[PDB]
Amino acid sequence: DAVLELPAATFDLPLSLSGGTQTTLRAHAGHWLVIYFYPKDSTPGCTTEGLDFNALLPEFDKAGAKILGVSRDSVKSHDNFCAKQGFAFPLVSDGDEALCRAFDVIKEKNMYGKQVLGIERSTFLLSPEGQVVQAWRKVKVAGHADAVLAALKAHAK
Ligand code: NA
Ligand code: NA
Ligand code: NA
Ligand code: NA
Ligand code: NA
């Protein structure tokens, strides 16, 4: 049922969160986890996406899931973004792109006469046993959080 195999070490990577604590993916064993990668704090698309997930948080709570947003912005940036927007879930400051590389969300584009690497907006659903059971890549924000919730409900049943 896995759609993506992560390196075993991924699950023990210390993930720096907004608010100054750390988590790991293994620490989330026992419940569903939505991991959404976004390119940049405090931009229109990324703010819309975060607010959409935030508005649905009680539905994720019903269904036994936690949410983590991920970008490579700093903890301080994340703290500002969370405070301004009122997010009630954490943001991972993946400053070294360790988590991004594990999920293969750093994508290359031929532009400006060069090879340019950047975060591709992408979301994943991790089962209570740490399996990646659904992936969305090159995400369109509109309708996305709703679609992720619907997929979670389908998988969790
Ligand atoms: Na840290
Ligand atoms: Na860190
Ligand atoms: Na810390
Ligand atoms: Na999990
Ligand atoms: Na998919």
UniProtKB/Swiss-Prot annotation:
Transport recorded as keyword: no
Disulfide bonds: C46-C82
Membrane-spanning intervals of the chain: none
EC number in record: 1.11.1.24
Keyword Cell inner membrane found: no
Gene name of this polypeptide: bcp
One Gene Ontology biological process: cellular response to oxidative stress
Complex and partners: Monomer.
Name of this chain's protein: Peroxiredoxin Bcp
Protein family according to the UniProt entry: Belongs to the peroxiredoxin family. BCP/PrxQ subfamily.
Domain Thioredoxin: 2-157
Source organism (scientific name): Xanthomonas campestris pv. campestris (strain ATCC 33913 / DSM 3586 / NCPPB 528 / LMG 568 / P 25)
Keywords carried by this UniProt record: Antioxidant, Disulfide bond, Oxidoreductase, Peroxidase, Redox-active center
